[PDB]
Ligand binder design. Structure first.
Ligand code: NA
Ligand code: NA
Lengths: 473, 487
């Protein structure tokens, strides 16, 4: 039926607001709700998988651990959300260890995605069995969809958003925050000016400008990615080619294999031997030894030709906007994100203000009780029951049942001189807070300034240098 | 293993390997078979405890099985959900367990080949009997140990307020050795236990006879009939025996052969299949047609019709012969006692259970006694404060800080820091007339409790009487009529 697709496209494509699919959102939220934060010891992955399975994804589905694992791989995510410990696989064919052998916890950036989620910043909905509530989206204090990108298949409509530099994106966002009046085309230009292009975790080089611009303005484009090969004098002492970087998503093992197989086919003469000298110290380092009668330049170009040393990234900016799949331009992605940020901020202050009032209400009744301490005390001791006392206090002080209950819940230790003053002082602080909150609600410029300052803090702390180099040649 | 005369470097490695195996498998066996005390294997114990720790109690709504499977998987059994759900499911089937521990809702399968629904479609919760297995587990009644990752503690055994191992029985294979204990009647077992409680001085031969006298034999949840006495007796006195089970066929006619019960563990579908596949092979001539007419509200009903020629029950006898309408239960009372597998006699099973019950009770009393004292300590200081209420109140209001107040109170009342902190933690509502009296009354109750507790610790007869009364209560509520009929 019509809702069939609406569900297939839910597991297939990412939301534009946080850039996540239901699985990942569930996993992250589960870890959060479990307290698996960065300032705490890693927890066995089985714990996270289990918390997700029982509350949100009731399947012995391998897709849970698969999501947890992937969000931990620095070669897959430009900005990882999971902090892994143990065997989480490799850029090659080496498979990850079982749930029970690995440990995981959230990264500081992931903590920014969940920031203030308990302050009604996003809409929650009941889970599969209706016992608990789950988030439809995360606050996403940092532009995750564009930062980490996304890749998924729908009914022939598969998304393919590339990763980007956090510092750059933040610049584009800051511009959109100040130029709220601007029109799309005026914005499309400013954002395209700040975001130089994709920034893959694997580094490498992007060759050209067409693919990028096409993607940013038409939501579709072919980006030319190229590995990084160095030329070295070997112990031969002749020439050896050294590939230190590969294009995004290129499997190291499959790559080396294609070279050896392509060679045997006779398609890659000039090559004497291939050897992997990679390591955590040296990083990627595939040494290709060329024959003494060979030109480095010709071998290189033949590599670009017959291997993934040079490959294309087929960008397709397709995301879910209000439950409907859509192909977007960079300016739309940016505006939809900013809108969400603003929505989060108003909702946050709306919530804080409500709770601030409830707090002040109680305090006003505690202060009243203080000004009549001797009376309330005698009244309470004279009362045969707490009910009588509750009723007597309401009458005696002119307060409601909640306020009257707060007084009866008060502890002896709060009667100490400095304790009593603390109640007074608090009341003043709370009233001042309420005012400031009401001010934010009244001024859209204040709200805009808040998202800007908070985002700036985030970029200062977690922002990093660009990895992928753009080559106009 | 092997033998000695070699003097080689390859034989040093051979000896060590044999040693590691012995140690290795001597430990694996501790898992394959059930413990004497609670009758459970680690999987089941973990599942039950997880449900308990989650609050999935009989007095609350069923929860999706996936929740139970998940709680188990993450805290105690991180290997997968297959083994877990299978255990949860098995413990909910009234045709498998004489006394189910899990209360299932939805498709938990059938006595035949119909498979259960997925964990997201079924719901489950603990039965009242399961709640008895976990009774007082939070009062240091059993030894706990850290779990796989050391983040949480898990039980090595459950309090087991009812004789589960003998009640529900058990069947497993560890290392060539496989246990096979049959289920029994709770009311009967309780009688045997009550006897052992009163006749603590009795000897093996006497106890054996006394218990064999109260437990008439296995009582399968699938009812049926046991033919003979040798098998049963053999099992109860040698820990091994062959018990003959028989279905219940009550033939009828037109209007123009009805099997209503099958032996324990006999698959309904496989049974009917064996009949048809054999008949068509001519091996079972004299049968016109088979027909399943069972349904909830009627029960098992397999209709078998004979040819005109033979209206003889000789067809019944041919059934007993070539089908599972009559099959044997190979009893083998093998359980884990102190980490070591052992074949036991009914009296040993009974005494080891009683010992555990007694252990649980003194441990419970010991714990309750400690907590009471800590409680009485606090109360004594709250009462003191009450007798000087006006003073303590003025003192507190005069104190510039809670520290000053804490110090002032210690002096003023002659009490320690803990007692002095309890007073400062006291709430206004506790100053109400009836509230104040409640503190006084409590102190008297606590002191009385402590005394009684200390008494239990001193008297073994009191401890024995406690397990007897509590067990009696359980049998009155959850005990049920016998199902299997003997001879
Ligand atoms: Na008021
Ligand atoms: Na005292």
């Amino acid at each position: 039926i019509d809702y069939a697709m609406s569900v297939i496209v839910g597991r297939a494509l990412p939301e534009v607001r946080d850039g996540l699919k239901p699985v990942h959102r569930r996993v992250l939220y589960a870890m959060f709700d479990s307290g698996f934060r960065p300032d705490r010891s890693h927890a066995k992955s089985a714990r996270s998988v289990a918390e997700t399975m029982g509350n949100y994804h009731p399947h012995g589905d391998a897709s849970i651990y698969d999501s947890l694992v992937r969000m931990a791989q620095p070669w897959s995510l430009r900005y990882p959300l999971v902090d892994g410990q143990g065997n989480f696989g490799s850029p090659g064919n080496d498979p990850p260890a079982a749930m029970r052998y690995t440990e995981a916890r959230l990264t500081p950036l992931a903590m920014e995605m969940l920031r203030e989620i308990d302050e009604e910043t996003v809409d929650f909905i009941p889970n599969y069995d209706g016992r608990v509530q789950e988030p439809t989206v995360l606050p996403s204090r940092f532009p995750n969809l564009l930062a980490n990108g996304s890749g998924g298949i729908a009914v022939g409509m598969a998304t393919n958003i590339p990763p980007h530099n956090l510092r750059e994106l933040a610049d584009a966002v800051f511009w959109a925050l100040e130029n709220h009046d601007a029109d799309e085309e005026e914005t499309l230009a400013a954002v395209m000016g700040r975001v130089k292009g994709p920034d893959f975790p694997t580094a490498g080089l992007i060759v050209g400008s067409q693919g990028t611009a096409d993607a940013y303005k038409t939501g579709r484009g072919s980006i030319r990615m190229r590995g990084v090969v160095e030329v070295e004098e070997d112990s031969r002492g002749r020439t050896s080619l050294v590939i230190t970087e590969l294009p995004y998503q290129v499997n190291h093992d499959n790559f080396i294999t294609s070279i050896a197989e392509q060679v045997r086919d006779g398609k890659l003469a000039g090559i004497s031997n291939i050897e992997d000298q990679s390591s955590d110290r040296v990083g990627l380092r595939i040494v290709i030894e060329i024959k003494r009668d060979a030109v480095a330049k010709v071998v290189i170009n033949n590599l670009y030709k017959h291997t993934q040393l040079q490959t294309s990234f087929g960008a397709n900016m397709l995301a879910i906007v209000d439950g409907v799949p859509r192909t977007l331009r960079l300016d739309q992605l940016i505006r939809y994100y900013v809108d969400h940020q603003l929505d989060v901020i108003v909702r946050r202050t709306t919530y804080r203000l409500r709770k601030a009032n409830e707090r002040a209400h109680i305090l006003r009744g505690l202060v009243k009780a203080l000004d009549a301490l001797d009376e309330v005390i005698a009244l309470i001791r004279a009362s045969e029951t707490v009910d009588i006392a509750r009723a007597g206090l309401i009458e005696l002080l002119d307060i409601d049942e909640i306020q009257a209950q707060a007084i009866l819940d008060m502890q002896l230790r709060r009667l100490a001189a400095l304790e009593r003053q603390r109640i007074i002082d608090d009341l003043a602080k709370i009233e001042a807070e309420i005012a400031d909150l009401e001010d934010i609600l009244a001024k859209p410029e204040r709200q805009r300034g808040i998202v800007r300052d908070e985002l700036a803090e985030i970029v200062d702390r977690h922002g990093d240098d660009r990895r992928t180099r753009i080559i106009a040649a």
